[PDB]
């Protein structure tokens, strides 16, 4: 997250860190046994870390659970990143408490202008790099579909939404992928891709979660 702030200790209890030796992607807890993330974050071996604040120090609220089932959307396209959504079923149920909570799926798609909360342990620099130990937060508005497409000509599908600032400076970045975009307590987006990080006229592009509610519920019910 570039241009954000350090989140209040465990003020994003639904945030998860996908680990395979080290943090490589984010995700979000939607129920005691399932995590939603980005399909491009796929790996054959994944340890899900819950209740994380400072990913480099054991604080005492963490729960480390191995992923049992890893299911990428059947229509995921690695070249366009269309349908960049993935579901993970934990090997054992997560214990829900004050530091580990689930986030609600959307009842309807978010309207342009809706302010949301984006979070992650990704790069905080637009040039070079700097990875934080503490979870970073960023408040940003959903952009009109028109704006989104004009920023990324011929690259925006109906399954993508832009969230951020055309002026640049504040944005998600490498390491934030799979992370949540929450608007009014509902998961509306998943960190997917973008042109560089925090560049003007190049806001972050996110998976439009409201288009996948049916698929998510059906996949969970079937597995």
């Amino acid at each position: 997250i570039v241009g954000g702030y350090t989140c209040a200790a465990n003020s994003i209890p639904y945030q998860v860190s996908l680990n395979s030796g080290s943090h490589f992607c984010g995700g979000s807890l939607i129920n005691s046994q399932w995590v939603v993330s980005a399909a491009h974050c796929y790996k054959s071996r994944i340890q899900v870390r819950l209740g994380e604040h400072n990913i480099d120090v054991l604080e005492g609220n963490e729960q480390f659970i191995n992923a049992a089932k890893i299911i990428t959307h059947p229509n995921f396209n690695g070249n366009t990143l269309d349908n960049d959504i993935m579901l993970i079923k934990l090997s054992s149920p997560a214990t829900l408490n004050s530091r580990v909570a689930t986030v609600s799926l959307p009842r309807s798609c978010a309207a342009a202008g809706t302010e949301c909360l984006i979070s992650g342990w990704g790069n905080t620099k637009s040039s070079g790099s700097s990875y934080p130990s503490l979870l970073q937060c960023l408040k940003a508005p959903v952009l009109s579909d028109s704006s989104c497409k004009s920023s990324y000509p011929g690259q925006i599908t109906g399954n993508m939404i832009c969230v951020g600032f055309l002026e640049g400076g504040k944005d998600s970045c490498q390491g934030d992928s799979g992370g949540p975009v929450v608007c009014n307590g509902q998961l509306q987006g998943i960190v997917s891709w973008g042109y560089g990080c925090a560049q003007k006229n190049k806001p972050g592009v996110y998976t439009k979660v409201c288009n996948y509610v049916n698929w998510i519920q059906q996949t969970i019910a079937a597995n």
């Binding site: 490589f24 980005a38 491009h40 974050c41 990143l81 990324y152 970045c173 973008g194 560089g196 560049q199």
Partner: peptide, 9 residues
Amino acid sequence: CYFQNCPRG
């Protein structure tokens, strides 16, 4: 990722 489109993983 600099001056190009890339996933943010």
